[PDB]
Amino acid sequence: SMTEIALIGNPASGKTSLFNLITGHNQRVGNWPGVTVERKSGLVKKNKDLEIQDLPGIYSMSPYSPEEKVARDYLLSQRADSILNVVDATNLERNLYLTTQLIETGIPVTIALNMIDVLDGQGKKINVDKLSYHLGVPVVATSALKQTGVDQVVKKAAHTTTSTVGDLAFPIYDDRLEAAISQILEVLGNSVPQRSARFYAIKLFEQDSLVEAELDLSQFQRKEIEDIIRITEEIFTEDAESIVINERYAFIERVCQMAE
Ligand SMILES: CNc1ccccc1C(=O)O[C@H]1[C@@H](O)[C@H](n2cnc3c(=O)[nH]c(N)nc32)O[C@@H]1COP(=O)(O)OP(=O)(O)O
Ligand SMILES: [Mg+2]
């Protein structure tokens, strides 16, 4: 059985550059079914038992672009063994916004902390093991330009899979949001897989139109969820989508502070 490694990150994070280094000239290109979004994959040049599934460069997993939808559907399909998340070290906080959402899918994340050579030139520093510790994911510093850390991150990702990793270490948000997520999980029951339950619970909280349309929820489930959102919005005096956005960035800021 092939180990399937999903490669994803923001646009201009160096994902293509790393894809090309990892796979060399041996790639397969097409489209995702029913859409014109490119579907690209390649075997790891130095370990052909590993397949890299490239995913479109995105900033978030929102319902508003074909590229974001392709990434989400693929990651929620449970076909990937590992997520290899390419992160631009020179724009860390902005890049980790997506990372928090990737962790929540329940497919173990490994980070290629890319552009590390640029960071050195800007007079900036990132303490890699502290960043890893506080994100709850492996992190390996890479440079696609200098060609460093690449084989190392691929090896880590290959040994950090849905088979090898036990409990999910997910970003923990404010107690008030966690209460809402917990109650949505109770309402969900077995309507979604345990592995991705948190992804779905957060999406429901923020009234993601794709999840709402796809899930077969009872009238009672929908009423329970509506109630949870209403009271949670009242206690934050903020709309549900904004609450989640603010909590993601707060977590990211805390991690980046504790990692310097
Ligand atoms: C002809 N080329 C240029 C001429 C002048 C200026 C830039 C370019 C140009 O091509 O920049 C590319 C990279 O080479 C560089 N780049 C990528 N990784 C690294 C890295 O680790 N370090 C450095 N210094 N640069 C990197 O960052 C860019 C984005 O990498 P993409 O892979 O495209 O990102 P997505 O796949 O969208 O995620
Ligand atoms: Mg250290």
Widest beta sheet: strand line-up = 2-3-4-1-5-6-7
Shape: globular
Strand portion, in percent? 15-25%
The CATH class assignment of the largest domain is Alpha Beta
Q: What is the radius of gyration?
A: 18 Å
Biggest β-sheet description? 7 strands, mixed
Helix content range: 40-55%
Binding site for GTP: 9-16, 34-38, 54-57, 114-117
GO molecular function, one term: GTP binding
Binding site for Mg(2+) 3: 127, 129
Binding site for GDP: 12-17, 30, 114-115, 117, 144-145
Question: What report would you give on this structure?
Answer:
This protein has 260 residues and is of the alpha/beta class. It folds into two domains: 172 residues, 3-Layer(aba) Sandwich (Rossmann fold); 88 residues, Helix Hairpins. A seven-stranded mixed β-sheet has the order 2-3-4-1-5-6-7, with helices on both faces. A hairpin with a 6-residue loop joins β2 and β3. The structure holds 3'-O-(N-methylanthraniloyl)guanosine-5'-diphosphate (BGO) and magnesium ion. Magnesium ion binds next to α5.
Could you give a short description of this structure?
The chain has 260 residues and is of the alpha/beta class. The protein has helices at residues 15-23, 66-76, 92-104, 116-121, 128-135, 150-158, 175-188, 197-205, 209-214, 219-236, 240-258; strands at residues 3-9, 27-31, 38-44, 47-54, 82-88, 109-114, 139-141.
